[PDB]
C-alpha cells in the first residue's frame, strides 16, 4: 500500500494570492507508460470530493484555469492562481498506479485569510416544548466571525458553568469567508427554574471586551 502524505494539514491564504499544496507518495508512481496516475480532488464543506486534476496536470471537466498541477515521481504540487472564496475546502490527492489498493492523502484544508469579523451573538431561552419534556437548553449563536479562534463562557446568576455545554462550529462559509459557532447550555427543567439570569460571553480577537447577550427568566 502506497502512502500519500499531504503537507501541510492546513494552509491560510488571502484572496487574490496563490497557494501551493504538496502531496508525496511512498514510492514513485510513474507507470511504465506516461507519467503518474496522480489525481487531485477538492471537497467543499458539506459536499463530496470532486476530481480537479488527473494525471499530474490534466484539468478535469469544468475546472478553472487557475488550478494547475505540477511535480514528478514522488513529489507533486497543486497550485491555485488568484485564490477565490469558493476555493476553500479540503484538497485531497489519490493514486491509481500501484493498485490495489487506491490510496488517498490525509487532505489539506484551504482556509481563506479574510479580514477580522466580530461575532453576531444571539441568545435563546428554552422553548415551551422542551420544558414540557423536563429539559431546558439555552442556545447561543455566534455567527459570521473571523478568525475561528473564539471562547464562549456560560454564566448562571453571575456564576460560570462548564458542564452541560455543547459547542459546534461550522466550516468556513464561501459566501463571506467567516465561521459560525453554536453554544448550547443544556440543563434539566428543575435546575433552570431555580435561576434567573443566563449569559453567554464571547471573547474574540476583534474586541478587548467580551460580547455579551443575556436574559432573565422574568421575560
Amino acid at each position: 500500500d502506497v502512502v500519500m502524505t499531504q503537507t501541510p494539514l492546513s494552509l491560510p491564504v488571502s484572496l487574490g494570492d496563490q497557494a501551493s499544496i504538496s502531496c508525496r507518495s511512498s514510492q514513485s508512481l510513474v507507470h511504465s507508460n506516461g507519467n503518474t496516475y496522480l489525481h487531485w480532488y477538492l471537497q467543499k464543506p458539506g459536499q463530496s470530493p470532486k476530481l480537479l486534476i488527473y494525471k499530474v496536470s490534466n484539468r478535469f471537466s469544468g475546472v478553472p484555469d487557475r488550478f494547475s498541477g505540477s511535480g514528478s515521481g514522488t513529489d507533486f504540487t497543486l497550485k491555485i492562481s488568484r485564490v477565490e472564496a469558493e476555493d476553500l475546502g479540503v484538497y485531497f490527492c489519490s493514486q491509481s498506479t500501484h493498485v490495489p489498493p487506491w490510496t488517498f492523502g490525509g487532505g489539506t484544508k484551504l482556509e481563506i485569510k479574510r479580514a477580522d469579523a466580530a461575532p453576531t451573538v444571539s441568545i435563546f431561552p428554552p422553548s415551551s416544548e422542551q420544558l414540557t419534556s423536563g429539559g431546558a437548553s439555552v442556545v447561543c449563536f455566534l455567527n459570521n466571525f473571523y478568525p475561528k479562534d473564539i471562547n464562549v463562557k456560560w454564566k448562571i446568576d453571575g456564576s460560570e458553568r462548564q458542564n452541560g455545554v455543547l459547542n459546534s462550529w461550522t466550516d468556513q462559509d464561501s459566501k463571506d469567508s467567516t465561521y459560525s459557532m453554536s453554544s448550547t447550555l443544556t440543563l434539566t427543567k428543575d435546575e433552570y427554574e431555580r435561576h434567573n439570569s443566563y449569559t453567554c460571553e464571547a471573547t474574540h480577537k476583534t474586541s478587548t471586551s467580551p460580547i455579551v447577550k443575556s436574559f432573565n427568566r422574568n421575560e
Binding site: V99, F104, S127, Q130, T184, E219
Partner: protein, 210 residues
C-alpha cells in the same frame, strides 16, 4: 454526471446492509465503479471496485473489507450494489458511490454500525425572548445521523447556518439558525424543516413569537 446512493442507516454490530447506487449523465456500462468511504479516523479509504462485462466482471477489495463486502453492478438498471455482510463498528462512515478512479462522485450515504435504536428527533423552536433578526431550531435526541435542515422548504438559504451534530448521552444534538430582516418576521412566516430519513420522519417547525 450524477450518482445517487440509497440504503444505509443504523445497523447493529454483526448485521448486514445493502447499498445501492443509481447513475446517470454518462454510460454506466463503460466505467469502473468504486465504493469509497470517509470517516474521521480513516480519512478517505477506497473499499471496492468492479469493472465491465468485457473485464470478466472483475472485482477488487480493500484488505480490511475482503471476505465481508460484495460489490455488484447491474448495467440494465445502471445500479451498483454493495452487500455488506458481518458489519463491525469500524465500518461506520460515509460511503461514496464513484465512477472511474475517481472521476465522478455521488452525494454519499451514511452508515452507522451501533447497537442502539433508531430515534426520531425532537425539534424545538428558537425565538428571540437590530435591522436583522436571527431565529433558530434545536434538534435533540435522535439517532443515528444524518438529519437535514432547511428553512421555508429551502426558500431561505442565504442567511442560514447549520451546525454539525454532536453525540452525547442525549443522542445527537444539532442546531440551525436563520437571519432575516426584522421587518419581515413574524409577518412573513419562518419555518425550519428537519428531515431524519433513518426514522422515516420529517418535522416542520414554524418559529412564532414568544
Amino acid at each position: 454526471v450524477n450518482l445517487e446512493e440509497s440504503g444505509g442507516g443504523l445497523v447493529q454490530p454483526g448485521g448486514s446492509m445493502k447499498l445501492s447506487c443509481v447513475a446517470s449523465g454518462f454510460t454506466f456500462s463503460n466505467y469502473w465503479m468504486n465504493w469509497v468511504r470517509q470517516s474521521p479516523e480513516k480519512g478517505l479509504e477506497w473499499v471496492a471496485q468492479i469493472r465491465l462485462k468485457s473485464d470478466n466482471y472483475a472485482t477488487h477489495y480493500a484488505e480490511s473489507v475482503k471476505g465481508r463486502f460484495t460489490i455488484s453492478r447491474d448495467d440494465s438498471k445502471s445500479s451498483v450494489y454493495l452487500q455488506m455482510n458481518n458489519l463491525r463498528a469500524e465500518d461506520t462512515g460515509i460511503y461514496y458511490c464513484t465512477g472511474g478512479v475517481f472521476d465522478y462522485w455521488g452525494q454519499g450515504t451514511t452508515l452507522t454500525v451501533s447497537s442502539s435504536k433508531t430515534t426520531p428527533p425532537s425539534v424545538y423552536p428558537l425565538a428571540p425572548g437590530n435591522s436583522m433578526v436571527t431565529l433558530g431550531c434545536l434538534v435533540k435526541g435522535y439517532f443515528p445521523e444524518p438529519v437535514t435542515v432547511t428553512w421555508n422548504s429551502g426558500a431561505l438559504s442565504s442567511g442560514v447556518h447549520t451546525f454539525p451534530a454532536v453525540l452525547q448521552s442525549d443522542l445527537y444534538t444539532l442546531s440551525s439558525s436563520v437571519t432575516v430582516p426584522s421587518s419581515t418576521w413574524p409577518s412573513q412566516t419562518v419555518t425550519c424543516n428537519v428531515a431524519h430519513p433513518a426514522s422515516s420522519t420529517k418535522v416542520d417547525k414554524k418559529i412564532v413569537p414568544r
